[PDB]
């Protein structure tokens, strides 16, 4: 028996049940009018300070988030080399225990950002909330079931979008050029890796109307290379999508990914290399005089 | 890149508070789920159209075997061994001919449509298990179990006089469950998208009544 | 018309999965009856547009007339013959060109950006689908000089995918045209379709995503006061203001700061607001707009601060702009405390004639020229007093270094500011000199004055 | 001069169309002319002849035909090879008979191919049927045949592979496009110039 | 006219040269690696190469053919990328609001001019 749907159901149920609970609470709050500084604000302020880097504990938490995002991405990269669905012992799988701990920390960081949030519904629809709903619940389900599906785990790469924000929190990024460069690099890499993971999932699991018989055995790095070739418009043709869903995804990505590549790669290359050629200072020579000339130089 | 990296000489009442922005984002989401559900319904509908008609056009029948025999010729199956390892092994060909409910004439039995398409010249294929001896043993085992089935029990069979004109199948190759899930979950996406819009408008309009009440 | 165009396109999409020519019973084919009715409606809509036309010959040569001549008659012939050919039925996709026009008729599309976006999307999609249908027809029916033997069995969606790959210039080579007519069509499409893709896809992506990041409105918090700041907002102006407002030498104030400005903040201002994430909020709007003033909740703000551009080219223009801002804020809410910077003194006199301008309630016009010339005059009574006064306002921490230099002593002196607070009943009934010599080093506090209200250095008789 | 009203714009669009049809017709004539050139010369260079069979025999070797079964289903079946040799009107020497140029090109080593009908037995039966009908045709009636000493140097055909009707339609309808384009220009200029005379008459 | 003439003549000439070079093989390979390419096939290959589509169904295989392809990729893509947009801009420069009003018998009309916004 296969269990792929249990992981996916846990994410869908989490995202939409939370959204419906929030909307029902709103509805019923106003409906009570038909029948008819606080500690809440103090904990909201404390959570907002923790979320920012205004304290030592907040800085430690932000650095931990930065490290654990890369850790989870590396864990997904390790798992991407295995079969699509498998049975594996939680008590004897160090990577599953490490993932379990990482997702505990992300659940806690999610809880802190929820408490700190001003508009809950606005928070529930912030995309790094969506990234947590589509990546945290399936880890819990896997650790409970003693089984894993390599399903939507490529969405972990979207965690790189917050890197510039948490670098600005840590008082590291100050200049506009550096901020823009980090933003562009993060968006480019996360988009590339996420799209590669999705096309990897879709190619390795065939079309349902073809009874999953036309699947193509493509590795994650092969899909990454194919996406790079497609984005740059080189189009070698050695590697390409063959399933109907894969090609349907390829068509929608060709509209967005080429505009991203054509826009971001020149701008990144302009932002880098902005070095001053004439820097440094003169070194005096003993026994030889020197003359400084300034004013109208042409 | 594309067109010299897009260059070419530079060719080309408000009483509601902050909650308004979260609610307008909730309308957006609910609308996007409505569109997604409808679009995916059409996409899956075009993909299922030919398989579903090729399946619907095949009628159920009652069958009985006329004969079981070998044609003396042999064919390659592929046998597998981890990473990418494969080689080929022979199997002997059986043919089986069967009584038919629509044409009342000779047709050749093929266990399923994948067997028909992988070797239309032959009636059965063994799962390739290394050596030729095990393929021949497994064909002889299936052959003996089919040869004595003479009118024992008119087993049901699937036929299509328009595209399997003298070929007959023992199974449907179209899983009803897989089709059901392909049309159910886009419908669920659409219903969830409607409920999100409805609850968002219900909350938005009750906020105005609860404001005017004060 | 809008619905039936999509209906006919969907009917063509259904038929594109069948053989190229076939016999089918009109009395037993629901799709052929539906197509029959759809084409009746298009014949009627064509007749109405013909009657409404001014120049008939101009109408006969309008391309949606041509699209009807190439799509309506063959449906009639098919319904008469009880047979169908999947011929020029892909021209139905050209019906999407009129979508923007009929949306403008229905008073739906009004803005230029939305009209342009709809036009570009319609032209792109219709061109793509029509070209895909034509290449599908040409590939599935081979070359006449090759006796139709070199035909390639390509599905319509396969041709759509091939066209997308060709337009974007990716050119995988997995799917390509093989017939001579198909390649001849490919060559002419490569000239036009790549120029369309290269032009339209960036422009569409620019038109979408034009969202305002700083929208919404401030949400007041019970028990906590907030302050609205407007006028000259820039990285250095906000950075200097926040250093003085949020300094650790004040007591534990939790006043929120809300900025209102009509320019989107640059990346360095957004980083400055992120470094103050729990104490500063920014909202993009105009102070002259009552909607924006309601958005920043200025009716419940404790005060409104209006910073001025001290280095402006035109002091008169800057004073006029600040006067207009004050007028707008007072007009929205007369009872709002307003603190503003005024470059000149005659403009300050102009401003204080406002009916809602109440200096007693706390309206302070900080006149820069007046205060600086007064500070210069006090330096004429005692040299160094301008420095003495200026350092009493700026919030400064103690700074200490090991070097014995004049700077150490100077910084030690600079560490003090002027404050104001109520004093103990244990000092009521004493003389002002007496409480001063008491406070001086026992409490470590120096008094310049007390609340006949504001009295600078009282005598021994008070 | 601009006494004509709005009708001027419809008539200038009608001139455009008539000119575009003239250009289309001429361009398509050249395009079809270049595409038909090699097929038409390869057909013209093959002369009509009178033939008679020298012998009918099998070479004992067998070949694959492909047999078909809906969607994409195909497999292969053997057929036995006949060869047939024939008297010739241009070289007066041995040549091998090939029923048509597609048969010559699909298997130049062999004289006939059966339409593949599933099993080998039906292919062999259909070859034996054709073989027996050809073996007794000895001088019975000098059947006409097609030959080309320059590109089918010892090979002979029973049929022309070039349909005259398909070529006729490929050159006729571009000519019709051109004639219609001329008549549209002519009637548009005739209407435009008579409108000026009917205006000056008032 | 200048752009169209230069584009077409360059395209056809380059196609003819690559046709000559592909049909007559390399002298160091003793003319044995020749590729039987028709002139129109070479024209199509040049168009595919210029537009940067690069299907790969048709390509040069001889050493001289590839050496020619490398030098043409430098010039022909810059020509295509520059000329095709400029030609497409030059065409289609039509005035949408032309023509003239047609009076209707029995109905009056009013002409409005000056500051129109
Ligand atoms: C904060 C730092 C963040 C950055 C990084 C921290 C990442 C944490 C996880 C590292 C892997 C640790 C581990 O359990 O390794 C496993 C081996 O696999 C390896 O040793 C992988 C070595 C290749 C490079 C990674 C242990 O062996 P296993 O239990 O048999 O492996 C199970 C999974 N597998 C079979 C798919 C390999
Ligand atoms: C660990 C990462 C540490 C980053 C340090 C950043 C830093 O110091 O900024 C500097 C380097 O300028 C940049 O930040 C741009 C160079 C690229 C940074 C890419 C970071 C990873 C992005 C994700 C990629 C995907 C990963 C998978 C400059 O920043 P600044 O604003 O000029 O700082 C003020 C100058 N001062 C500090 C000298 C006074
Ligand atoms: C912290 C830094 C972490 C390092 C990140 C870099 C990670 C890059 C690591 C690449 C691993 C290579 C896989 C090789 C392999 O398994 O063979 C596969 C082909 O593999 C390819 O085709 C390689 C394609 C290059 C991918 C370029 C990645 C650059 C992403 C840059 C951004 C990434 C961020 C095929 O395998 P097989 O034999 O057919 O399968 C049976 C066995
Ligand atoms: C064919 C593909 C074309 C994609 C066009 C997408 C719409 C873009 C758009 O601006 O719609 C707009 C309305 O629309 C809505 O309120 C619903 C948003 C979901 C639309 C999903 C379309 C697929 C989206 O809203 P907006 O203008 O982004 O306003 C918020 C800022
Ligand atoms: C205003 C709304 C506009 C939007 C849409 C309205 C479109 C109107 C036509 C819809 C099809 C109705 C119909 O007759 O279906 C047919 C099946 O085919 C389907 O049911 C197709 C299902 C796939 C998605 C479409 C009925 O079965 P049939 O008679 O055997 O089918 C004949 C054609 N066929 C064999 C090629 C399938
Ligand atoms: C059914 C279609 C409904 C379209 C609604 C349009 C609409 O409301 O316009 C809005 C969305 O802005 C747009 O119109 C742009 C978003 C893309 C629309 C694409 C429509 C389909 C095009 C064919 C694609 C191929 C299909 C196959 C904005 O329009 P506006 O001018 O700003 O309106 C005034 C604002 N007011 C109404 C809020 C006061
Ligand atoms: C057999 C094969 C047949 C296959 C394909 C052939 C089909 C190709 C379709 C050609 C039409 C494309 C087109 O340009 O339509 C035009 C309709 O014209 C108008 O905008 C004014 C009409 C009112 C719209 O384009 P445009 O508005 O001119 O362009 C916008 C920019 N302009 C305002 C800046 C200049
Ligand atoms: C209202 C919304 C309507 C939905 C519109 C979307 C309609 C899209 C629906 C696509 C249907 C997929 C066909 C699959 C198929 O039959 O297999 C074929 C391959 O098919 C492909 O190669 C798929 C290529 C992707 C096309 C992308 C369309 C996007 C157009 C977006 C604009 C469209 C507007 C091959 O078939 P076969 O097995 O070789 O043949 C024997 C059986
Ligand atoms: C005055 C107007 C004059 C008309 C000018 C238009 C002339 C165009 C005429 C093209 C003739 C087609 C040749 C077909 C052919 O012989 O088959 C060949 C493939 O042929 C192809 O691959 C066709 C490639 C399209 C070329 C596009 C030309 C456009 C140039 C536009 C600029 C041109 C100016 C292969 O042949 P074969 O069967 O492998 O060989 C054995 C037989
Ligand atoms: C080689 C391909 C080059 C294509 C060039 C097309 C001509 C463009 C042109 O402006 O001709 C012009 C003259 O022309 C006419 O009066 C007849 C219009 C049909 C010409 C068809 C050419 C193919 C077209 O007229 P125009 O200038 O569009 O004037 C109306 C606006
Ligand atoms: C508290 C909320 C967020 C939990 C999220 C819902 C998830 C966890 C729910 C939804 C459907 C549930 C699954 C439904 C069916 C099975 C199969 C059974 O053999 C073990 C339990 C298991 C595997 C359930 C596990 C929990 C489950 C996956
Ligand atoms: C975590 C998921 C599953 C449940 C979400 C909890 C929901 C039901 C509850 C818990 C606390 C509630 C919030 C408490 C405070 C506010 C601030 C008010 O100005 C708007 C409503 C809002 C935002 C409430 C909305 C509903 C709310 C978010
Ligand atoms: C539908 C096809 C088959 C026939 C079209 C009808 C023909 C015969 C007739 C009917 C109505 C006629 C039009 C009626 C009115 C005008 C306006 C006038 O100032 C110039 C002639 C013009 C433009 C006529 C042209 C010819 C016309 C279009
Ligand atoms: Ca101090
Ligand atoms: K390219
Ligand atoms: K390419
Ligand atoms: K390519
Ligand atoms: K390629
Ligand atoms: Mg706040």
mmCIF file of C-alpha atoms and ligand atoms in Angstrom, chain A residues 67-68 70-71 74-75 78-79 81-82 88 92-95 98 102, ligand 1:
data_model
loop_
_atom_site.group_PDB
_atom_site.id
_atom_site.type_symbol
_atom_site.label_atom_id
_atom_site.label_comp_id
_atom_site.label_asym_id
_atom_site.label_seq_id
_atom_site.Cartn_x
_atom_site.Cartn_y
_atom_site.Cartn_z
ATOM 1 C CA UNK A 67 21.242 27.865 9.551
ATOM 2 C CA UNK A 68 18.306 25.461 9.812
ATOM 3 C CA UNK A 70 20.000 25.498 4.762
ATOM 4 C CA UNK A 71 20.046 22.354 6.892
ATOM 5 C CA UNK A 74 20.501 19.878 2.441
ATOM 6 C CA UNK A 75 18.367 17.138 3.998
ATOM 7 C CA UNK A 78 20.149 13.967 0.387
ATOM 8 C CA UNK A 79 16.640 12.412 0.200
ATOM 9 C CA UNK A 81 18.750 10.610 -4.406
ATOM 10 C CA UNK A 82 16.461 7.833 -2.931
ATOM 11 C CA UNK A 88 12.297 3.721 7.130
ATOM 12 C CA UNK A 92 17.292 4.132 13.445
ATOM 13 C CA UNK A 93 17.355 7.034 10.950
ATOM 14 C CA UNK A 94 19.582 9.950 11.973
ATOM 15 C CA UNK A 95 18.378 12.104 9.016
ATOM 16 C CA UNK A 98 17.457 15.616 12.484
ATOM 17 C CA UNK A 102 14.478 20.983 12.517
HETATM 18 C C1 LIG F 1 23.085 23.445 10.677
HETATM 19 C C2 LIG F 1 23.925 22.851 9.524
HETATM 20 C C3 LIG F 1 23.103 22.717 8.233
HETATM 21 C C4 LIG F 1 23.870 22.032 7.119
HETATM 22 C C5 LIG F 1 24.093 20.717 7.009
HETATM 23 C C6 LIG F 1 23.621 19.642 7.971
HETATM 24 C C7 LIG F 1 22.898 18.487 7.251
HETATM 25 C C8 LIG F 1 22.412 17.413 8.256
HETATM 26 C C9 LIG F 1 22.269 15.994 7.655
HETATM 27 C C10 LIG F 1 23.632 15.373 7.249
HETATM 28 C C11 LIG F 1 23.547 13.849 7.015
HETATM 29 C C12 LIG F 1 23.763 13.029 8.312
HETATM 30 C C13 LIG F 1 23.331 11.578 8.144
HETATM 31 O O1 LIG F 1 22.484 11.048 8.836
HETATM 32 O O2 LIG F 1 23.977 10.960 7.112
HETATM 33 C C14 LIG F 1 23.528 9.669 6.613
HETATM 34 C C15 LIG F 1 24.354 9.306 5.350
HETATM 35 O O3 LIG F 1 24.399 10.416 4.430
HETATM 36 C C16 LIG F 1 25.461 11.269 4.472
HETATM 37 O O4 LIG F 1 26.399 11.172 5.248
HETATM 38 C C17 LIG F 1 25.371 12.319 3.371
HETATM 39 C C18 LIG F 1 26.765 12.793 2.894
HETATM 40 C C19 LIG F 1 26.719 13.679 1.630
HETATM 41 C C20 LIG F 1 26.709 15.195 1.909
HETATM 42 C C21 LIG F 1 25.521 15.653 2.762
HETATM 43 C C22 LIG F 1 23.697 8.551 7.685
HETATM 44 O O5 LIG F 1 23.514 7.249 7.085
HETATM 45 P P1 LIG F 1 22.046 6.623 6.873
HETATM 46 O O6 LIG F 1 21.290 6.642 8.143
HETATM 47 O O7 LIG F 1 22.119 5.236 6.353
HETATM 48 O O8 LIG F 1 21.467 7.627 5.772
HETATM 49 C C23 LIG F 1 20.040 7.714 5.653
HETATM 50 C C24 LIG F 1 19.662 8.527 4.386
HETATM 51 N N1 LIG F 1 20.253 8.066 3.038
HETATM 52 C C25 LIG F 1 20.183 6.541 2.910
HETATM 53 C C26 LIG F 1 19.452 8.687 1.894
HETATM 54 C C27 LIG F 1 21.701 8.518 2.919
#
